[PDB]
Amino acid sequence: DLQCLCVKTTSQVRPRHITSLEVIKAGPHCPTAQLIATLKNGRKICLDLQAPLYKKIIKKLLES
Amino acid sequence: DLQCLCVKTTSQVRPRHITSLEVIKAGPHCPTAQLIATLKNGRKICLDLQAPLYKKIIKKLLES
Amino acid sequence: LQCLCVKTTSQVRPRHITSLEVIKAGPHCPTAQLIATLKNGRKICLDLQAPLYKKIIKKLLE
Amino acid sequence: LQCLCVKTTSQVRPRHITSLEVIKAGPHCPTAQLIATLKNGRKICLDLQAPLYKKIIKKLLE
Ligand SMILES: CO[C@H]1O[C@H](COS(=O)(=O)O)[C@@H](O[C@@H]2O[C@@H](C(=O)O)[C@@H](O[C@H]3O[C@H](COS(=O)(=O)O)[C@@H](O[C@@H]4O[C@H](C(=O)O)[C@@H](O[C@H]5O[C@H](COS(=O)(=O)O)[C@@H](O)[C@H](O)[C@H]5NS(=O)(=O)O)[C@H](O)[C@H]4O)[C@H](OS(=O)(=O)O)[C@H]3NS(=O)(=O)O)[C@H](O)[C@H]2OS(=O)(=O)O)[C@H](O)[C@H]1NS(=O)(=O)O
Ligand SMILES: CO[C@H]1O[C@H](COS(=O)(=O)O)[C@@H](O[C@@H]2O[C@@H](C(=O)O)[C@@H](O[C@H]3O[C@H](COS(=O)(=O)O)[C@@H](O[C@@H]4O[C@H](C(=O)O)[C@@H](O[C@H]5O[C@H](COS(=O)(=O)O)[C@@H](O)[C@H](O)[C@H]5NS(=O)(=O)O)[C@H](O)[C@H]4O)[C@H](OS(=O)(=O)O)[C@H]3NS(=O)(=O)O)[C@H](O)[C@H]2OS(=O)(=O)O)[C@H](O)[C@H]1NS(=O)(=O)O
């Protein structure tokens, strides 16, 4: 009934452009964790789990 | 980067078992609208768009 | 009263809404909650009043 | 002050959390928002305090 939201991660986007980050735990409908980021223009993208980039994105959004 | 969350709809579930319903507009990452329902036990399922069932689920959750 | 929607809002541009989640009342929230997510990822609590969320759900279903 | 997280909470079972969304501050919300979604679909606003959301994000990443 449900699959993963993200097909492939991305590496390049400006942390300034990010308004929202959702962290989704692995579940019955997706074997891997997911990192969905929403941008000012409505564009949604996926981040890499094995990178410190998500750590940078998160640390910024909270600092705002 | 993103696909649809729901693969196939469902027809049978008890409206009593439903705690949350999310209505997702069609977008660049999914050609069709989506109706995701969350249940007390954590189970998530998709509803049918061409049915009055979603109308029943929604009308109940608000009445609660 | 430990709800997501303490104060609630009536003014929003329906075209800016990408999703609407209806969360049911419970021991922790006296009322149902209408959470709308906008294009920019932000969220706001919709007034449970009638014609507001009526038109929205249909515009999400087009 | 028309935020999702007016009042905020500190007591939640991390195993009950299925997702955590960080919404950034803006002209409409003075602070960033930590919205946690539980197994039963409900949502609660997490305290922006340190060790609460630190352990959670990692438990979501296992
Ligand atoms: C191209 O060069 C540019 O370089 C950088 C990068 O640009 S980027 O950010 O676009 O990538 C620019 O730096 C940014 O400059 C500002 C900007 O983004 O415009 C500024 O952003 C902050 O302030 C924005 C202006 O808002 S306002 O307060 O001055 O009015 C704000 O964007 C506005 O958000 C409001 C809002 O959310 O309330 C919007 O208001 C409108 O919608 C509201 C909500 O609608 S709803 O549907 O019901 O929900 C309505 O209630 C309201 O009536 C309505 N107002 S109206 O005017 O339409 O009538 C409005 O449309 C938006 O423009 C930013 O909000 S945010 O959501 O994007 O975060 C806000 N960001 S903040 O800094 O975090 O507070 C910053 O200086 C900077 O943005 S950034 O976030 O730091 O990246 C640079 O300005 C620009 N150079 S330029 O070429 O000279 O322009
Ligand atoms: C098998 O036969 C059954 O038939 C029907 C159908 O069952 S079904 O609903 O499971 O499908 C049963 O009818 C239901 O009966 C009640 C029930 O579901 O148990 C009742 O539901 C309402 O009340 C529940 C009991 O709560 S309590 O207030 O009395 O304490 C409630 O479930 C509890 O929710 C709380 C909660 O959300 O706060 C939970 O508390 C615990 O977690 C909290 C939050 O954690 S968090 O992670 O931090 O977020 C903690 O804060 C708290 O400390 C902790 N308490 S503790 O006990 O663990 O220490 C608790 O775990 C839950 O059990 C229902 O909440 S809900 O979220 O499911 O909606 C609530 N539903 S409500 O009616 O909408 O308010 C109803 O009568 C009915 O449920 S229903 O929603 O109408 O469908 C029937 O009882 C049963 N017959 S039986 O065989 O005899 O049992």
Author numbering:
A (entry chain B), B (entry chain B): 107 to 170
C (entry chain A), D (entry chain A): 8 to 69
Task: Please give me the paper's original passages concerning this structure.
To investigate how the GAGs might induce or augment neoantigen formation, we crystallized PF4 in complex with fondaparinux, a homogenous synthetic pentasaccharide heparin that forms complexes with PF4 as assessed by atomic force microscopy and photon correlation spectroscopy. We solved the crystal structure of PF4 in complex with fondaparinux as a model GAG. The PF4/fondaparinux complex is a pseudo-222 tetramer formed by a pseudo two-fold non-crystallographic symmetry and a perpendicular two-fold crystallographic symmetry. Fondaparinux appears as a well-defined molecule, evidenced by the strong and clear electron densities. The PF4 tetramer displays a pseudosymmetry characterized by an ‘open' end and a ‘closed' end that can be defined by the intra-chain distances between amino acids E28 and K50. E28 and K50 are ∼3 Å apart and form stable salt bridge pairs between chain A and chain C. However, the same interchain salt bridge pairs do not form between E28 and K50 in chains B and D, which are ∼8 Å apart. This asymmetry in the PF4 tetramer explains why calculation of its electrostatic potential identifies only two positively charged grooves on the ‘closed' side of PF4 tetramer surface to which fondaparinux can bind. Fondaparinux binds among monomers A, B and C or monomers A, C and D. This interaction stabilizes the AB/CD association and the AC/BD association, thus further stabilizing the PF4 tetramer. One fondaparinux molecule not only binds within the groove on the surface of one PF4 tetramer, it is also shared with a second symmetry-related tetramer through binding to its C-terminal helix.
HIT is caused by antibodies to complexes that form between platelet factor 4 (PF4) released from activated platelets and heparin or cellular glycosaminoglycans (GAGs). Here we describe and compare the crystal structures of PF4 in complex with Fabs derived from KKO and RTO and the structure of PF4 in complex with a heparin-mimic pentasaccharide, fondaparinux. NMR studies reveal that PF4 exists as an equilibrium among monomers, dimers and tetramers. Each monomer contains three-stranded antiparallel β-sheets on which an aperiodic N-terminal domain and an amphipathic C-terminal α-helix are folded.
